[model samples]
Target: RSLLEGEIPFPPTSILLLLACIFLIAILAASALWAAAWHGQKPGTH
Candidate 1:
């Protein structure tokens, strides 16, 4: 029999890497939102 001759449900290493990238993207998006909110909260300082 050869290696990888069976059906694998999933690859744990790949899944972990994907999750880390997703988390990084999420953090970046949240930071951008916060920046926008801060810039939009000036009342009479134009």
Candidate 2:
């Protein structure tokens, strides 16, 4: 059960697209977390 030698698996376009999607999601998640933290730190009327 060995991969064939001198064979490329997964097209280059697919790989790039996958990476772009992951980067986008990561940015969105980070933004959400940052916003939440900023909101939490805001002073409230005591």
Candidate 3:
């Protein structure tokens, strides 16, 4: 029943928080890959 429960009420601030988290994660992932390449890893690996 818990798993099938209805949607929870989320405030507008929640969306902003979610986006901030996503943006940070994207930036981190991009930087990691960029650094990996800058330090030398085959482009073909991508």
Question: Could you tell me how far off, in angstroms, the CA of residue 43 lies in candidate 1 after the best superposition?
Answer: 0.8
Candidate 2 ranges with C-alpha deviation above 4 Å: 1-8, 33-37, 40-42
Any residue pairs clashing in model 3, and if so which?
A: none
**Model 3 worst lDDT run, 10 consecutive residues:** 1-10
In model 2, the Cα lDDT at residue 28 comes to 96
Candidate 3 local Cα displacement, residue 32, angstroms: 3.8
Q: By TM-score, rank the candidates, best first.
A: 1, 3, 2
Where's the lowest-lDDT run of ten residues in candidate 1?
A: 1-10
Which lDDT values do the candidates have, in the order given? 0.83, 0.82, 0.78
lDDT of 2: 0.82
Best TM-score goes to which candidate? 1
Q: Candidate 2, residues 1-46: lDDT per residue as tens digits?
A: 3565636687789899999999999999989998888777549765
TM-score to true structure, per model: 0.46, 0.39, 0.40
User: Model 1 Cα RMSD, Å?
Assistant: 3.7
How many clashes does the backbone of model 3 have?
0
Give the local distance difference test score of model 1: 0.83
Question: What is the total number of backbone clashes in candidate 1?
Answer: 0
